Amino acid sequence: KTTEGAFYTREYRNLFKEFGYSEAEIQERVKDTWEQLFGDNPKIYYEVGDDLGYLLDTGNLDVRTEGMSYGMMMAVQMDRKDIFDRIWNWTMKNMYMTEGVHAGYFAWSCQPDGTKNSWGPAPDGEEYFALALFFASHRWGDGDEQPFNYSEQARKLLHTCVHNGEGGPGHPMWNRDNKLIKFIPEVEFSDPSYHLPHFYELFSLWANEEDRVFWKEAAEASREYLKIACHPETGLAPEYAYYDGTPNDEKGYGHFFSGSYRVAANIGLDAEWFGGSEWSAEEINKIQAFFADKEPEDYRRYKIDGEPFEEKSLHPVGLIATNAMGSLASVDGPYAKANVDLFWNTPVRTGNRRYYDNCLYLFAMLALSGNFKIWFP
Ligand code: NI
User: Fold this and answer.
1) Are strands 63-64 and 109-110 parallel, antiparallel or unpaired?
2) What's the gap in Å between 27 CA and the centre of ligand 1?
């Protein structure tokens, strides 16, 4: 480690402020971003009745565990128990599976009416659900009424993630030998953007005790994995990658595209929470170096070696936001201020592809203003 993280100091860097933005403009911008996403201006969050709500993937017309778990994380960071509970309530009602091989997990995609489009889960959903739930327990207390017994729900979910398939036909979400998160439970490859060692550090404190060593090991395995998965010159990570670190392009996910964008963001947040490292600063410096001579209107899909496709980035605003959030891992970096300034000058996205960009956008607003916090017991 290179700095002491917010986990130890309990002080979160306001990078916007350190980079010269006013406290009042920062506060305004964070709130505006929240309101444009969750307020009643068509927006990614939709209230339903007195007790339900969801985040809608405006592009695919579905509700994803990625968005629901994001929404819960967002709501707890913002101290909005009412929104948290609406979303978690819908998730438990419509997504949680009690039948089939993936019982104990959440169906990754549902229609807006709650109908499951698949009984397969998406591990990046599970890990955000668990952490958001631990934060909710810590901010608000566990409810007496299920499923609002947050910390128990979190421990029980992480039990399944690690141990599924011991007493039967299910699959764990992490490989037990290499401690790496999987793309989906029935495969033996991974997805670099799913790797959240800063989350696993907290799981090592709060999960069932029987798994606390495993989670500390997973955190360390994830850090090592990211070293091999990001290209050594450009810093770009593939969307999917084998355990050996190389891209899995069997179905076209072996390049730098939408999934990959979260790698830079995850690295920035881990640096802020658990401390900088030389590897992380150098990695962000490489990503930002690669995009320094590129205009946002021209962002493409790239091979991880930097070779451009004709195809444009489908989510260039999300790319901007994650690259900016990555600056938390290289606050003195040569491109860190340009990236934060570019994000500052990029509005929240409109149109039917806005959901993914805007989730990344709010996470970056929170993190860069010192508002993406660890909530302790
Ligand atoms: Ni203002």
Assistant:
1) antiparallel
2) 9
Distance from residue 26's CA to the centre of ligand 1 (Å):
8
Show the 3-state SS of the chain.
Answer: CCCCCHHHHCCCCCHHHHCCCCHHHHHHHHHHHHHHHHCCCCCCEEEECCCEEEECECCCCEEEHHHHHHHHHHHHHCCCHHHHHHHHHHHHHHHECCCCCCCCCECCEECCCCCECCCCCCHHHHHHHHHHHHHHHHHHCCCCCCCCCHHHHHHHHHHHHHHCCCCCCCCCCECCCCCCECCCCCCCEECHHHCCHHHHHHHHHHCCHHHHHHHHHHHHHHHHHHHHHCCCCCCCCCCCEECCCCECCCCCCCCECHHHHHHHHHHHHHHHHHCCCHHHHHHHHHHHHHHCCCCHHHCEEECCCCCEEEEECCCHHHHHHHHHHHHHHCCCCCCHHHHHHHHHCCCCCCCCCHHHHHHHHHHHHHHHCCCCCCCCC
Q: 376 lies in a domain?
A: no
Separation of CA 28 and ligand 1 centre (Å): 6
The whole domain housing 55 covers 1-370
Experimental method: X-ray
Centroid of ligand 1 to alpha carbon of 122 (angstroms)? 39
**Backbone phi, then psi, for 373, in 5-degree steps?**
-110, 160
Residue 206 sits in a domain of what CATH number? 1.50.10.10
Resolution in A: 2.1
Residue 173 C-alpha to ligand 1 middle, in angstroms? 44
Cis link prior to 147 (omega < 30° from 0)? yes
In a domain, 181, yes or no: yes
Would you say residue 375 lies in a domain?
A: no
Question: How remote is the CA of residue 370 from the centroid of ligand 1, in Å?
Answer: 19
Angle at 160 between CA 157 and CA 164, to 5 degrees: 165
What does the alpha-carbon distance between residue 314 and residue 203 come to, in Å, rounded to a whole number? 33
Q: How far is the CA of 258 from the centre of ligand 1 (A)?
A: 31
Number of domains into which the chain is organized: 1
What are the tokens at 80?
């909005």
Residue 343 lies in a domain: yes
